[PDB]
Design a protein around this ligand. Structure first.
Ligand code: CIO
Ligand code: MG
Ligand code: ZN
Length: 326
C-alpha cells in the first residue's frame, strides 16, 4: 500500500538526526518503537550477530510497545522510539568508531527502548509525595527507573519474547548489568553528578591520532554509555524546531495533567505544572541554559568536533524560543 511505501522512505533516514518520528508513528499504526527498533537491528546486523529469530524480536517489541501508555502525552512509545533512534545515531559518532562491542551496542539500544516503559505520566517526587505503591516498593530512590527496568526485563519471559535466548550466560549477565547501569542513570536526580564525572573524563581523555576515544575499563565505558543515553533522553531541544516544539507541547500537557492531579488532592503544585500560571517559553530557555546546553557542550567536547551540528541546532532553537518572549 502507499502508506507502507511512505513509511519505508521515512525509515531511510534512521541514521540521521531529525528523523520524522511523529510521521513514522502515524504511518506505522502507532508502532514507532517496533518499526524503528526492527530497522536499527537490521542496519546493525544484530539479528545475525546474536542469532535473534525475527519473529521473537517482533513479538517482544510489540509487547514492550504495548506497555507504554497511549494516554500519556510525552512518556510514551514515540519518546521511547525517539531515544532509541537518537542513541543509534550517537553510537555512530566518528569519535566512537569501533569503541564499543556489539554486546555494548545491543545493551545501549535495548536500554533506550525500555527506559521509560509503563511510565504513568507523573514524576518520582509525585509518587513519593502521594505515598504510592511504587515509592513504597522502591524506597523512594529511582522509583520509576527501577520500575522501567523491572518491566522491560520481565517481558522477555513472555511467550516467544526472549530475544537474548542465544546469548551465552556470560553475555546475558553482562548485558543485564549494563542495561541496569544505563537506565538507572536516566534518573534526573543523578544528572549533576553524572555531568561532573563526564567533565572530569573530558579533562584527561585519551584519543588516537584520528580523535577516536580510548576507553579500557568498565567504569569509563559504562560512563560514556550512561551519558550517551542520558543525552538522547535530553535531545529534544537539539532537534529541528518543528520536532522540538511538538515535544514541548507534549511535556507541558503531561506536566499540566500532573498539576491537575495535585490540585485535586490539595497538594502544592509542582514547578511548571500549573496550567493557570505557566511560562512555557521561559521554561524551555531555562531548561536549555541550566540542563541541556551544559550537558551537550560537555558531550561535544568529548567527541569534538562531531557534535557541532547538534550544538548549532540547540543554540538556534534557544535563540528562537527566547525571541518569543516579549
Ligand atoms: C521538551 O521539554 C522537556 C523534555 C523533557 C524534560 C524532562 C527533563 N528534565 C522532564 C523530567 C523527566 C524526568 O525527570 O524523568 C526527564 C525529561 C523536560 C522538558 O522541559 C522542561 C519541563 C517543563 C518545561 C521545561
Ligand atoms: Mg525516565
Ligand atoms: Zn525518557
Amino acid at each position: 500500500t502507499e502508506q507502507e511505501d511512505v513509511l519505508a522512505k521515512e525509515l531511510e533516514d534512521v541514521n540521521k538526526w531529525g528523523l520524522h518520528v511523529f510521521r513514522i508513528a502515524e504511518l506505522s499504526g502507532n508502532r514507532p518503537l517496533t518499526v524503528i527498533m526492527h530497522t536499527i537491528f537490521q542496519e546493525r546486523d544484530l539479528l545475525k550477530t546474536f542469532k535473534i529469530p525475527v519473529d521473537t524480536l517482533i513479538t517482544y517489541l510489540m509487547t514492550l510497545e504495548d506497555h507504554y501508555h497511549a494516554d500519556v502525552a510525552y512518556h510514551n512509545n514515540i519518546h521511547a522510539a525517539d531515544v532509541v533512534q537518537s542513541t543509534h545515531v550517537l553510537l555512530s559518532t566518528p569519535a566512537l568508531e569501533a569503541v564499543f562491542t556489539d554486546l555494548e551496542i545491543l545493551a545501549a539500544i535495548f536500554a533506550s527502548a525500555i527506559h521509560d516503559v509503563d511510565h504513568p505520566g507523573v514524576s518520582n517526587q509525585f509518587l513519593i509525595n502521594t505515598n504510592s505503591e511504587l515509592a513504597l516498593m522502591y524506597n523512594d530512590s529511582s522509583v520509576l527507573e527501577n520500575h522501567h527496568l523491572a518491566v522491560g526485563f520481565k517481558l522477555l519471559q513472555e511467550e516467544n519474547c526472549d530475544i537474548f535466548q542465544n546469548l551465552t550466560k556470560k553475555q546475558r549477565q553482562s548485558l543485564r548489568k549494563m542495561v541496569i547501569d544505563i537506565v538507572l542513570a536516566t534518573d534526573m536526580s543523578k544528572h549533576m553528578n553524572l555531568l561532573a564525572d563526564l567533565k572530569t573524563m573530558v579533562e584527561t581523555k585519551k584519543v588516537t591520532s584520528s580523535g577516536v576515544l580510548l576507553l579500557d575499563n568498565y567504569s569509563d565505558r559504562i560512563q560514556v554509555l550512561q551519558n550517551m543515553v542520558h543525552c538522547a533522553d535530553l535531545s529534544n531541544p537539539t532537534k529541528p524546531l518543528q520536532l522540538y516544539r511538538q515535544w514541548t507541547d507534549r511535556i507541558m500537557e503531561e506536566f499540566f495533567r500532573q498539576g491537575d492531579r495535585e490540585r485535586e488532592r490539595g497538594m502544592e503544585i509542582s514547578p511548571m505544572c500549573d496550567k493557570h500560571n505557566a511560562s512555557v517559553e521561559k521554561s524551555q530557555v531555562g531548561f536549555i541554559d541550566y540542563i541541556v546546553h551544559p550537558l551537550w557542550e560537555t558531550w561535544a567536547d568529548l567527541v569534538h568536533p562531531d557534535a557541532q551540528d547538534i550544538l548549532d541546532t540547540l543554540e538556534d532553537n534557544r535563540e528562537w524560543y527566547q525571541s518569543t518572549i516579549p
